Design a protein around this ligand. Structure first.
Ligand SMILES: Nc1ncnc2c1ncn2[C@@H]1O[C@H](COP(=O)(O)OP(=O)(O)O)[C@@H](O)[C@H]1O
Ligand SMILES: CC1=C([C@@H](O)c2ccc(F)c(F)c2)[C@@H](c2cccc(O)c2)NC(=S)N1C
Ligand SMILES: [Mg+2]
Length: 333
């Protein structure tokens, strides 16, 4: 059962406008195609065209990404499945904008209603909405694990400082599992604890950037939500569902020496080519997210691209890579 792959294109920034930049990317949601002009000046041109599961043009708002993509995934998490969403693409294209989002300028909005909010805040807010009074006891735990230069950092632990590296081990109980020694899990007791926890992440990320070269565009971040659910029947019997969601903001795809990013590409090649050895263990990212690539997790990829012709080759590289990823078959619960 194929993983889901969608492609989003960012809008032009203020610099590009003043330069009066023409888009090289046309998105057609009805067709679900992305079309890229690869040459030709105005009146005759060649293009490359790709169809994906969904396609979001440069005007798409965060709420549309949320309703289309994440909403049906979060329902699946609540049914006790595991899900993963990846953001993939060149630095500058909106991976962090999508996964996290931004604050509207000028304190116009509270966080829970900011229209520039991205997947992480919207998901956490919505979990408490969906389960207010339907008869399901639940708790919500989050962790934020990042990988930079094949080392692991905990971005939510307010006790350690970002410098301290974590150790990864195989999980004896679990064949396709790893234990991350020291990784903090924080309990989010209600929707009003959400924002302050995200803020701590952001502050730790600032320290990280100071300490490590090109940190934000070289480190992979895995933000996890675990929802432990319990229902009681009319007969007083307990029913248990556990759902885990990973929101993965990958290192920028552009080109250095990212072993996890190299390994991810090789894991996808092995999977789509049906070759029997898959090199999960050749990097920390793919050991951790093993079950998301051809395993028992439902999995989406959001491939972010740029509308500008300066970014042509890398936009092509991204769509090519996203397009073959479509052939990965996962086996959810
Ligand atoms: N879909 C979008 N809508 C509006 N602005 C965007 C969008 N995508 C990216 N941006 C802007 O583009 C710049 C780079 O995006 P960012 O999330 O940092 O990308 P990345 O994490 O891929 O390097 C940021 O200034 C961001 O505000
Ligand atoms: C805390 C925060 C974001 C949030 O998604 C986030 C940011 C950094 C993290 F390490 C993190 F785990 C979550 C994300 C966000 C969160 C909540 C609302 C919103 O509009 C935007 N973008 C911004 S600017 N901030 C300040
Ligand atoms: Mg980023």
């Amino acid at each position: 059962k194929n993983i889901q792959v969608v492609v989003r294109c960012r809008p032009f920034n203020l610099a590009e406008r003043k330069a009066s930049a023409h888009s090289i990317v046309e998105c057609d949601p009805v067709r679900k195609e992305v079309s890229v002009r690869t040459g030709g000046l105005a009146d005759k041109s060649s293009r490359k065209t790709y169809t994906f599961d969904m396609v979001f043009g440069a005007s798409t708002k965060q709420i549309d990404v949320y309703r289309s993509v994440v909403c049906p995934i979060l329902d699946e998490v609540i049914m006790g499945y595991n899900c993963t969403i990846f953001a993939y693409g060149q630095t500058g294209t909106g991976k962090t904008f999508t996964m996290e989002g931004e604050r509207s300028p000028n304190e116009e909005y509270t966080w829970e209603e900011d229209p520039l909010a991205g997947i992480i805040p919207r998901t956490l807010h919505q979990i408490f909405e969906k389960l207010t009074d339907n008869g399901t006891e639940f708790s919500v735990k989050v962790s934020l694990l990042e990988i930079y230069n094949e080392e692991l950092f905990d971005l939510l632990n307010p006790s350690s400082d970002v410098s301290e590296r974590l150790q990864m081990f195989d999980d004896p109980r679990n064949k396709r599992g790893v234990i991350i020694k020291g990784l903090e899990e924080i309990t989010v007791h209600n929707k009003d604890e959400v924002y302050q926890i995200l803020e701590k992440g952001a502050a730790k990320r600032t320290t990280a950037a100071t300490l490590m070269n090109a940190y934000s565009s070289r480190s992979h971040s895995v933000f996890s939500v675990t929802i432990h659910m319990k229902e009681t029947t009319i007969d007083g019997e307990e029913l248990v569902k556990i759902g885990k969601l990973n929101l993965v903001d990958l290192a920028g795809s552009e080109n250095n020496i990212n072993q996890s990013l190299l390994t991810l590409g090789r894991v996808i090649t092995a999977l789509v080519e049906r070759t029997p050895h898959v090199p999960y263990r050749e990097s920390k990212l793919t050991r951790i997210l093993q079950d998301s690539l051809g395993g028992r997790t439902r999995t989406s990829i959001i491939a972010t691209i740029s509308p500008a012709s300066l970014n042509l080759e890398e936009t092509l590289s991204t769509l090519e890579y996203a397009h073959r990823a479509k052939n990965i078959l996962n086996k959810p619960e």
